[PDB]
Design a protein around this ligand. Structure first.
Ligand SMILES: CSC[C@H]1O[C@@H](n2cnc3c(N)ncnc32)[C@H](O)[C@@H]1O
Ligand SMILES: CSC[C@H]1O[C@@H](n2cnc3c(N)ncnc32)[C@H](O)[C@@H]1O
Ligand SMILES: CSC[C@H]1O[C@@H](n2cnc3c(N)ncnc32)[C@H](O)[C@@H]1O
Lengths: 273, 273, 273
């Protein structure tokens, strides 16, 4: 509703995860405060231009990685992006791998998820009196997924074209027994802590949201179990590749998502009672 | 404790789910306010007669479906019914099916459940100093289950005589990856959002509680994934069949549940320390 | 920070579970109040001597079993023990068995866990601005596990040397359908309600924590499902065996945990960003 400075708008949102605290990519950056009914977003939103397209960047953990996954104000974050007018949201995330062939340094563009969080407090914007139950059979925006895959291929990076993300609560990493369940029983491919309820809220807000995930580790399955320092080090080492992909894809997002390839773009039509 | 009007009592409770906001079935209806230590129940409770048996009706979502599953005051709802003196509780619910032969329009009388909720805040009435751990191996009241099955058969409707209900958090529906876990890994039969913690609280209150579920959809497994509008439309289309079953069964509930076929009727005897 | 009386310190902590409300074991007991940023621990901590080693005893449920698993102030409990200077923490717990050969009366020293809680509110001490993600691949302290096993063997008791503990929310026990998932799908060995987030917090506080579990029941798999009264009766019947093990092991804990056999002893080195 109210922004400071007033009148700011953007077309593409980028939510940065681990290792991605500054835009890097935007020209003419302005830091913006956006009012939300839920209090503060993770940080200021930075708005600027990438080759003529207006981009809003939000670090989900805040500058300096001040906010762990369970403490993020997901409602405020998504409300703020919607309020600026964005239609496309690219999430950049660090994930662990549960399979040998999804190697550290590879990108993954997931197509499914399993929610094993428990402590996120709000999993929706809609608490009544209008009851909303969005369909999320195909939870990610296909239009954006396909563009991410294409960019990665063009630039010569390895991009796995599907994957099931298991979202765990944290902040601790999984035990060996848990990780065996995720891998062998649920047949998940990658694991992270931040996707839910971010994706749920993006869908309810009728945004075209997709995740560009970077594999940073093999969970508990290597000679060395994952540590936080390893994840951070691998993301910071590879952030330049993520930046190059963003520069490639963002100018192609000048238009609007195709309705037929955006499962959530009209989510509320059939979902509200 | 206090009711307005004062002195109202009932013997059978009916909790209405999706599509069932008005009693329809009761004669001489009075709307009743029942004090609870937990604040407001979902709506007024309507008390009236069905062939000489006093019935209390509560729409779990409120009139007009104002309250989504995660926001329902389950403690207030069950406390209010207990306070009016009910011994039997029939829950009417919309569920999805995870198997081909449980078809939209069929009734199911489940015998088991798996709780995959996360955000319901209170899963018990007992927070100390008396610690209560009720056994729920067989969570539904067999006496009532059998009467529901019998009524359905007599009226010529399809009633599946068992089923495992997986209760998910919502309000979003399942992803395809989640639904595969519910179906193929957990081997659940039907899926819904409202059973837990309603059933837990009913058991702790020593009520004979059973669910009459109506299949409204096949989850994510049909050419079209479930939508909220579909569920509502199917329930409203079939509400008359649910009403006929209630009219048949309620007069047979004039007495008391048989202790040997009511797992929760003396739950507190062995459960409290 | 502040204790009353002032200046009290201890080297070994014992957290008592079901049936273990009084130390029994300590000489020269003093009841101590320990300030925490999270309010009251479950009860006074009792500090005393066992053969020259200072021991702090805390009943997790409080004296008289006043606090159910979901209502325990886990943060306060672990903070209070850390504040007194303890390096070793022995947890004594009642568990159910999901396998025929883990029989009521047997001890188990688990090596893994699966967290299926949902309502514990805080799963960490670290909510920002320093983000902490501890590795818990091997969640228990091996040094202490091995000493517990050794003591049990020396005293002639049956001690199972490994096991996966599934932690459920409660306070109700599992349905038959849930218990089949824990046993047949997750391949867990034992089940309880109190391990999480106690273990998570112990690890973050860099303590050497292990569980000595006593099997009290076979969950839903016997002619009689578990009841709370059965669990309490079996623990109180066997508490003397648990006491004998504590007297044997505590004097051997005069020193410090071996770093190479204490996965959490330097947890924060790699975990904090
Ligand atoms: C900076 S370390 C913490 C971050 O690592 C991400 N992540 C990376 N690898 C894993 C893993 N194996 N399991 C869970 N989350 C992980 C999570 O989303 C979290 O925000
Ligand atoms: C009116 S649409 C929402 C309701 O649908 C019910 N329900 C119907 N089908 C499903 C399904 N496939 N998954 C989950 N809940 C469902 C839930 O209990 C919820 O209150
Ligand atoms: C005194 S009865 C309740 C206690 O029993 C323990 N427990 C014993 N058997 C089981 C079981 N089968 N399932 C869950 N918890 C159990 C739990 O940790 C809880 O604190």
């Amino acid at each position: 509703e109210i922004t400071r400075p007033p009148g700011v708008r953007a077309h593409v949102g980028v939510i940065g995860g681990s290792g991605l605290y500054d835009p890097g990519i935007v020209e003419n950056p302005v830091e913006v405060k956006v009012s939300t009914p839920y209090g503060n977003p993770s940080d200021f939103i930075v708005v600027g231009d990438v080759a003529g397209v207006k981009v809003a960047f939000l670090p989900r953990h805040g500058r300096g990685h001040r906010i762990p996954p369970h403490a993020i104000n997901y409602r405020a974050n998504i409300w703020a992006l919607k309020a600026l007018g964005v239609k496309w949201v690219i999430s950049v995330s660090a994930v662990g791998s549960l399979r040998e062939d999804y190697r550290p340094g590879d990108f993954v563009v997931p197509d499914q998820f399993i929610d094993m969080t428990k402590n996120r407090r709000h999993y929706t914007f809609y608490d009544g009196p209008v009851t909303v139950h969005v369909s999320m059979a195909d939870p990610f925006c296909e239009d954006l997924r396909q563009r991410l895959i294409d960019s990665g291929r063009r630039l010569g990076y390895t991009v796995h074209e599907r994957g099931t993300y298991v979202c765990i609560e944290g902040p601790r990493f999984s035990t060996r027994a848990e990780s065996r369940v995720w891998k062998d029983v649920f047949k998940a491919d990658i694991i992270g802590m931040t996707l839910v309820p971010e994706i749920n809220l993006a869908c309810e807000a009728q945004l075209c949201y997709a995740t560009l995930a970077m594999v940073t580790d093999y969970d508990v399955w290597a000679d060395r179990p994952v540590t936080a320092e390893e994840v951070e080090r691998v993301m910071i080492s590879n952030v330049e590749r993520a930046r190059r992909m963003l520069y490639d894809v963002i100018p192609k997002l000048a238009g609007e998502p195709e309705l037929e390839r955006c499962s959530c773009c009209r989510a509320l039509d059939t979902a509200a009672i």
